[PDB]
């Protein structure tokens, strides 16, 4: 509680379900559930506690996803436990690692100063994001809410962690999913068209929007609504062809859309933007979902070559965070890419 100590029987987020007593203190409300910050008594480490109503007749979707995951670029589920409310009401409590900053907050610092994030950080943040996406996608899990607000950031170590799996779902080919998902600025165009048979490549579109935003200093597609979101995309990429539209949603064959020319892609970004950043962005923000890079292919992109330099260091004089501890799971979509991904000095 506030300055009381609360002791609960909680299950560790990894391994078998053997609950044990866990104590925490210093609860403070941060913000469809409720989110608290707390301190674990045994270690003093700060945690976030997400508390949501949970019906006993089914298992929490977010919890079942979180328990599968163990990756340095994904927020850790330390524990989970259940608590009470209204007659027979039960809350699920997800005890997550607490990280003080996000990419949203850090990038907003540079915007208000009218400045741009130095590209070394763009490389570091996007690389770790793509690693987290390769990892979750290897399980069939789509995050469905990739945006700067869901990218935890430790500014001292430059470690990035993907968080807020409340929208995430295991996508199964042949089973429909909801189309009004993802935050609007980062929503893939096939979702805007109302596709229900989409794939994990919607996360790659969202990541491309994040990369563009970090390069630009503001969201690249600031739509006023679902339809205006697509208009904003079209103002940059031009009208999708009839073919690209069919690849996004095959239900628009009786319609011919006005032809808008694409903006010159280099003129979208500031003059000195690295060409490899622009090239990577163009391979993420593709209308045709199957044309987008996979997360693992994105990690191998030339834009991240600086991160594989043996002499690379953070601007604060510290070593780079873990970048090359790839697992078989993470590499499973294209294992030979490890020849690029793991440099000789990292073996």
């Amino acid at each position: 509680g506030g300055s009381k100590v609360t002791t609960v029987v909680a299950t560790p987020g990894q391994g078998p379900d053997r609950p044990q007593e866990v104590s925490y203190t210093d609860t403070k409300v941060i913000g469809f559930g409720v989110v608290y910050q707390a301190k674990l008594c045994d270690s003093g480490e700060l945690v976030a506690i997400k508390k949501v109503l949970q019906d006993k007749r089914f298992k929490n979707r977010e919890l079942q996803i979180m328990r599968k995951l163990d990756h340095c670029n994904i927020v850790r589920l330390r524990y989970f436990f259940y608590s009470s409310g209204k007659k027979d009401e039960v809350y699920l409590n997800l005890v997550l690692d607490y990280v003080p900053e996000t990419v949203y907050r850090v990038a907003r610092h540079y915007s208000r100063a009218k400045q741009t994030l130095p590209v070394i950080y763009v490389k570091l943040y996007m690389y770790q994001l793509f690693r987290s996406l390769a990892y979750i996608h290897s399980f069939g899990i789509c995050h469905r809410d990739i945006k700067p607000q869901n990218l935890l950031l430790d500014p001292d170590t430059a470690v990035l962690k993907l968080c807020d799996f409340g929208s995430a779902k295991q996508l199964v080919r042949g089973e429909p999913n909801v189309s009004y998902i993802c935050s609007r600025y980062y929503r893939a165009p096939e979702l805007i068209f109302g596709a229900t048979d989409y794939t994990s490549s919607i996360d790659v579109w969202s990541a491309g929007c994040v990369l563009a935003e970090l390069l630009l200093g503001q969201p690249i597609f600031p739509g006023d609504s679902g339809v205006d979101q697509l208009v904003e995309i079209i103002k940059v990429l031009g009208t999708p062809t009839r073919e690209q539209i069919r690849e996004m949603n095959p239900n628009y064959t009786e319609f011919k859309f006005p032809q808008i020319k694409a903006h010159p892609w280099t003129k979208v970004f500031r003059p000195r933007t690295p060409p490899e950043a622009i090239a990577l962005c163009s391979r993420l923000l593709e209308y045709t979902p199957t044309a987008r890079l996979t997360p693992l292919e994105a990690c191998a992109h030339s834009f991240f070559d600086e991160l594989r330099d043996p002499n690379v260091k953070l601007p604060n004089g510290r070593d780079t965070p873990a970048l090359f501890n790839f697992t078989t799971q993470e590499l499973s979509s294209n294992p030979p890419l490890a020849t690029i991904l793991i440099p000789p000095h990292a073996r």
Partner: peptide
């Protein structure tokens, strides 16, 4: 349902053409 969305999109694109 596509018919409603497409008609809206066509008008918004004509306003920028």
């Amino acid at each position: 349902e596509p018919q409603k969305f497409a008609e809206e999109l066509i008008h918004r694109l004509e306003a920028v053409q």
